[PDB]
Amino acid sequence: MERYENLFAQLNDRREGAFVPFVTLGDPGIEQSLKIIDTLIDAGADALELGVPFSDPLADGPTIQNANLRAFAAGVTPAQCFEMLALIREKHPTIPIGLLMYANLVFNNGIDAFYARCEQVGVDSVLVADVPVEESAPFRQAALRHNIAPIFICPPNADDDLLRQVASYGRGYTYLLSIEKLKEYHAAPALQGFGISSPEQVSAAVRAGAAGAISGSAIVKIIEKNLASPKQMLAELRSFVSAMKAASR
Amino acid sequence: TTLLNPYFGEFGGMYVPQILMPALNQLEEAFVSAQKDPEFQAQFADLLKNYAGRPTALTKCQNITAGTRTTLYLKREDLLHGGAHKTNQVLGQALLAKRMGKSEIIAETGAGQHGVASALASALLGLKCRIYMGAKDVERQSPNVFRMRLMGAEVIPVHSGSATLKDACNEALRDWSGSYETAHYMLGTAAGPHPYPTIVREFQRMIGEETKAQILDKEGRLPDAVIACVGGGSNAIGMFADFINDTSVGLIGVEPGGHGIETGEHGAPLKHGRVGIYFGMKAPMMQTADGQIEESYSISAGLDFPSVGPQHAYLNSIGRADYVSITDDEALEAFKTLCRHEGIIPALESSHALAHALKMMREQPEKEQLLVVNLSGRGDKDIFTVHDILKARG
Amino acid sequence: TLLNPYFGEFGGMYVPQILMPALNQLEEAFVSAQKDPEFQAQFADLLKNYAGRPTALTKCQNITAGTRTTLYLKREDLLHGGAHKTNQVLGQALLAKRMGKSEIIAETGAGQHGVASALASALLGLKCRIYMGAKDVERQSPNVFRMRLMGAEVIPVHSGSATLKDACNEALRDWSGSYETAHYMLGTAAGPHPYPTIVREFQRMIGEETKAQILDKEGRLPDAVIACVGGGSNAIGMFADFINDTSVGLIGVEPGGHGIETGEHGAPLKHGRVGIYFGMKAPMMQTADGQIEESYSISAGLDFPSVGPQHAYLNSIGRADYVSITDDEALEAFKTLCRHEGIIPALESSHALAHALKMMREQPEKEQLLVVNLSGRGDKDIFTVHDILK
Amino acid sequence: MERYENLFAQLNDRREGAFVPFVTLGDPGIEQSLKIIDTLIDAGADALELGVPFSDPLADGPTIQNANLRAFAAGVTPAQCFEMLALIREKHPTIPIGLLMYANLVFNNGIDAFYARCEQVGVDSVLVADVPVEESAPFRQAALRHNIAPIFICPPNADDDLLRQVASYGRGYTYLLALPLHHLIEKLKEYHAAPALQGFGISSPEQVSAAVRAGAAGAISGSAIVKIIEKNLASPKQMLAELRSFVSAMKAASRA
Ligand code: NA
Numbered sequence A: 001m002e003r004y005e006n007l008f009a010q011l012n013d014r015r016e017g018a019f020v021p022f023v024t025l026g027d028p029g030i031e032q033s034l035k036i037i038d039t040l041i042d043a044g045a046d047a048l049e050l051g052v053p054f055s056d057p058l059a060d061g062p063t064i065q066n067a068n069l070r071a072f073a074a075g076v077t078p079a080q081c082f083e084m085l086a087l088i089r090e091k092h093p094t095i096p097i098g099l100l101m102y103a104n105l106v107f108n109n110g111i112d113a114f115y116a117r118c119e120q121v122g123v124d125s126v127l128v129a130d131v132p133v134e135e136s137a138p139f140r141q142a143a144l145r146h147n148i149a150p151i152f153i154c155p156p157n158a159d160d161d162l163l164r165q166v167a168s169y170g171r172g173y174t175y176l177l178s179i180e181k182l183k184e185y186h187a188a189p190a191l192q193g194f195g196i197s198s199p200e201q202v203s204a205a206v207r208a209g210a211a212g213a214i215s216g217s218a219i220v221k222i223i224e225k226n227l228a229s230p231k232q233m234l235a236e237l238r239s240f241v242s243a244m245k246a247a248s249r
Numbered sequence B: 001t002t003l004l005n006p007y008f009g010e011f012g013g014m015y016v017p018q019i020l021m022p023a024l025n026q027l028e029e030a031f032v033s034a035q036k037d038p039e040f041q042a043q044f045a046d047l048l049k050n051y052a053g054r055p056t057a058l059t060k061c062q063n064i065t066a067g068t069r070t071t072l073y074l075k076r077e078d079l080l081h082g083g084a085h086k087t088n089q090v091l092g093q094a095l096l097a098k099r100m101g102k103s104e105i106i107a108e109t110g111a112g113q114h115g116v117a118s119a120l121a122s123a124l125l126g127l128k129c130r131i132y133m134g135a136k137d138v139e140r141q142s143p144n145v146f147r148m149r150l151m152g153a154e155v156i157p158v159h160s161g162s163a164t165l166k167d168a169c170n171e172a173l174r175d176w177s178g179s180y181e182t183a184h185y186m187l188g189t190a191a192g193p194h195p196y197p198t199i200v201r202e203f204q205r206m207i208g209e210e211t212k213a214q215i216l217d218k219e220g221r222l223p224d225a226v227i228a229c230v231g232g233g234s235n236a237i238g239m240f241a242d243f244i245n246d247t248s249v250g251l252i253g254v255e256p257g258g259h260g261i262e263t264g265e266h267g268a269p270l271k272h273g274r275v276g277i278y279f280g281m282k283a284p285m286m287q288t289a290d291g292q293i294e295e296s297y298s299i300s301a302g303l304d305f306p307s308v309g310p311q312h313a314y315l316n317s318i319g320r321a322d323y324v325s326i327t328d329d330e331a332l333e334a335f336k337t338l339c340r341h342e343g344i345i346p347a348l349e350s351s352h353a354l355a356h357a358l359k360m361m362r363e364q365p366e367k368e369q370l371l372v373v374n375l376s377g378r379g380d381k382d383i384f385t386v387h388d389i390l391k392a393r394g
Numbered sequence C: 001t002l003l004n005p006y007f008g009e010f011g012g013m014y015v016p017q018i019l020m021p022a023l024n025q026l027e028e029a030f031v032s033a034q035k036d037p038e039f040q041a042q043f044a045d046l047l048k049n050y051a052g053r054p055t056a057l058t059k060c061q062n063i064t065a066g067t068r069t070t071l072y073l074k075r076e077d078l079l080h081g082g083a084h085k086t087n088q089v090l091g092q093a094l095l096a097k098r099m100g101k102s103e104i105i106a107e108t109g110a111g112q113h114g115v116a117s118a119l120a121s122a123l124l125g126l127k128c129r130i131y132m133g134a135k136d137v138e139r140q141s142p143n144v145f146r147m148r149l150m151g152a153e154v155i156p157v158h159s160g161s162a163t164l165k166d167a168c169n170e171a172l173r174d175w176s177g178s179y180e181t182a183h184y185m186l187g188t189a190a191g192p193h194p195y196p197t198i199v200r201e202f203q204r205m206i207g208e209e210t211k212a213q214i215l216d217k218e219g220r221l222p223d224a225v226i227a228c229v230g231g232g233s234n235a236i237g238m239f240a241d242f243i244n245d246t247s248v249g250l251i252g253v254e255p256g257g258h259g260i261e262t263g264e265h266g267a268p269l270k271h272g273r274v275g276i277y278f279g280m281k282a283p284m285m286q287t288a289d290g291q292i293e294e295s296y297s298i299s300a301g302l303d304f305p306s307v308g309p310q311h312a313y314l315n316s317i318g319r320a321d322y323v324s325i326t327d328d329e330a331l332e333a334f335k336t337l338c339r340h341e342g343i344i345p346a347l348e349s350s351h352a353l354a355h356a357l358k359m360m361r362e363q364p365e366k367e368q369l370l371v372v373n374l375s376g377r378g379d380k381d382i383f384t385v386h387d388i389l390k
Numbered sequence D: 001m002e003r004y005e006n007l008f009a010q011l012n013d014r015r016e017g018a019f020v021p022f023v024t025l026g027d028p029g030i031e032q033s034l035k036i037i038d039t040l041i042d043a044g045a046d047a048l049e050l051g052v053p054f055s056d057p058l059a060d061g062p063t064i065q066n067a068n069l070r071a072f073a074a075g076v077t078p079a080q081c082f083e084m085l086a087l088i089r090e091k092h093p094t095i096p097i098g099l100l101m102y103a104n105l106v107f108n109n110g111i112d113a114f115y116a117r118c119e120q121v122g123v124d125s126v127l128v129a130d131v132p133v134e135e136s137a138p139f140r141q142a143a144l145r146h147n148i149a150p151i152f153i154c155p156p157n158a159d160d161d162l163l164r165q166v167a168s169y170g171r172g173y174t175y176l177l178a179l180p181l182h183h184l185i186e187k188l189k190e191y192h193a194a195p196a197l198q199g200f201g202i203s204s205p206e207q208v209s210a211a212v213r214a215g216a217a218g219a220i221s222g223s224a225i226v227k228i229i230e231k232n233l234a235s236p237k238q239m240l241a242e243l244r245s246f247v248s249a250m251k252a253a254s255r256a
């Protein structure tokens, strides 16, 4: 539905890309993460992308493997992840909240019973990291039956066949990994997500024609460096987020 | 999309990140081509026979069946070059890879047997081979690491948190993402995303074919049942394949029972797990109520996999195969029996299969039973594991 | 005796009188079994269905690149137990059973002959006792455990030197008293008659299989078969069938150690002197006044100061040609076969291999159909090769 | 030629068995071994058999295995033993001397040259430990060419075929070790064998007189006398006096 479309609207007639930070729900703890969430909004984050700690993250690199390990060994459950989402959505009822899921946490007790929960808590999108467009049919259904936008990675080895299917099936934004024609096929707006560490990389992305950028490792790399010092962690996130979102103006 | 069917009933699939899909599809296409090419079928067959040593022997147990009506044959994959049945699929995939133009093999290993399999096939077909190993297992396994390097491979220890088999698995997989044009990923079981279950069965199915032929020669009939251990499912599907349409032949797979099923530290997902999506596939796995992947336990490293190849899940759903479990202790006694009364040191994996055959015999000692147990591999690697248990026990 | 104890001048039964009855009884039992087609088939079923004969005849792929050498490897490393000794041990176990014997005695150093006798005894229901230098019992905990797992009884000898030549002493002392119930499993083709004959006969299927397989894959006999010669059993088992095929070279490779001129070798065939020892008249490394002198080689199995009597003979009549390979040539051949053929050879057999690469690289335009006897798996030599490389 | 016959003669004239000690030449050292040998003679040893240290003695047991390593490690050589033998023979021209040899030391550079050195220095008999009668032709030949008695062990698994062989080929004495032990001793006298000496486990004087009672001409003790030597390495003179005590008790156990 709307929260993503209502955001790329006002972002396009302010002539500016979107900045989406990525963080693992409940990392390093439930209460500290809530604060991390808010700091990121108050520093100028246009949308969120929250990950749900999973025992086995195939498709995430080193820094996100460890953030995932932090929250998981600490006991953060997917059920707790939803109680935090309810607090989040009710404090900032306008901001698009995407989820980064792993297939088995979606599939576990019904693909449909999942996407229902996302709808009723206020989530907006769901990226399933280990479900390619070829296996997506049952997730695209449950997604649409509950007004949840399915996000698909478009990789740099993508042929015209897949560009088609990402454009048709994909709503919200299209998460792409680094010069293209996804717009030609009427795809949801593209968000660059390959190696967004600098503000430099972010304006490199917008200048390249993207609707915005997502940085995962960079933002949680900050969490990792300041586990002992929760208040430093928050302040250093403010510096970074504001510095990045500003490189999109 | 997909030349071949990726599913076996519900189970199977290609549940992987989009970025990997071109590599799986190119792998599947190259494999379909080679399955039709008589020069590949001939070249592979020449390797299996003159380098690996196929056919392997089918040993009749003289002593341990005494005073019973059961006749126990042992299919001797322990005699295959490299000591285990994994050499079949490894030479197969190296052939496939040299055919695809690829010049590099990627692999990872835990205990280290698969690393050595890969390294030796890479050495033979002139492929540059790099093996990921958890930094822990590099300490534990200095002998294996040295064999791999003796054979030209490059062992790359991983430290990324964890630091065991399911963590090299990430570095090796991540690596493959970026180099599938140049390197083949040597998966080591009949599990994971399509086409790996199908390729692996096809490069292992000659175990059953030899066994069918060998038992027909010695006994003039088909066996009552074939028995094989089921960790990832590769040796079992290799023995089961040719018997699948011989309805009279019981297909029995043995999952590791750990310390007991009720204790919940086993490795028996087929019978005691739940379908979930993981390791690229939809398969029964051991998981918690909220869908985290549980840890499996077995005294045998080979059997210590929290899921199982999808074709086994399919065989169990339609009634063809019967899956049972055998505990550490049960497998321990089978292992000692075979050393003492047959002069064969089995691997602790195949020992689970042995133990279930002796159970079938010792429960009905007057039933006429012609059984085949697949001895998936040599037990020399397990001497220390076994010595420590027997020392602790006295 | 029933058969001829000599090969020309070499061989004999040079043992204390007390041991002659055991040896004659063994010979008579053997002569009888050799003419019983039911023994022959029993032995042959065992070799095929338990031990896994025939063994592969493998064609090197990369090793002979850019040369006209075609190099086959007879793969006794794939035999059950990892080495060619399984053949003679199963046959002796079968013969011991045929004689009513219920026990086996045996001697071991590094432990692989102990393991072979243990597994043959576990299969065939014999009660097996293995003598082993207490030195060698703590340097090989794994094989000791294997022999006990596969449980014979390992009797450690603390007499003088805890080494293989002092386990032979008590093994024999033991057989002396117990020959009516126990068979002594001599581990090579040396020693007193009928052992050099019995061992040849229970290994000759190596060469027979090779002749058949090579007549099948190349339609001709090979130019030369190459084997390392320590005790002499894998070599004579490779040679036996080819003795009457004049065209076929028989090349036996003794270990040159650090070099023949350094005196630390194990090549008594070409640099020793005929003497009497271990119950046979054979060339042996001996000091000027007739002490048996120490052999050296980095391969344990090749560290024998003498050689089987049939090789001394084949070399006297010039039918076989004996050369040497040094520690370091052998080492480099070990490394080559791992790196380029995916096979880890034993340090013994890699003396034979190394000589084949010498014959190849010195005449690489020359057409050569060579077979090399890979006498054993090399998983046992890893630590010896690891140290040596620092 | 002389000494074993002239000895066995007077022994049964004064009706008595012979006692023969075995020691290893140059054990524990050359100059100590000559003294050991003189003590053995002075305490009543009728003949003596000396072993030459060989690097790899098979037919031998643990006590003798080590006496051998002691002289070998000390670099006693066959040449040094032959010098000793001469010094020994020159001082007791009477007593029969037997060598206990290993084939290779006899064969090393000529069976015949070996036996001519024996005769040249005064030895009377050679026992080659690892030459059964079946292989003995060249050694017996060399022996008779040089008036050396060839000694042969008659073991307890010995059939009548071997007893006749031994009775024909042996000179000096039969070295003795399954029907009564006397029906080995009787069969040998029936075939007119050289007188029997029992050399199986002769360690205490009560075994020496048991050996003479069963009908043997005497008794040999290998390890028992060598045992005393190993016991007293630290104490060279206590050794000589423990051997004097032992040999005289041994020789007295044979005064019937
Ligand atoms: Na499993």
Ligand code: NA
Residues within 6 Å of the ligand: C229, C230, C231, C254, C266, C267, C268, C302, C303, C304, C305, C306, C307
């Ligand atoms: Na030698």
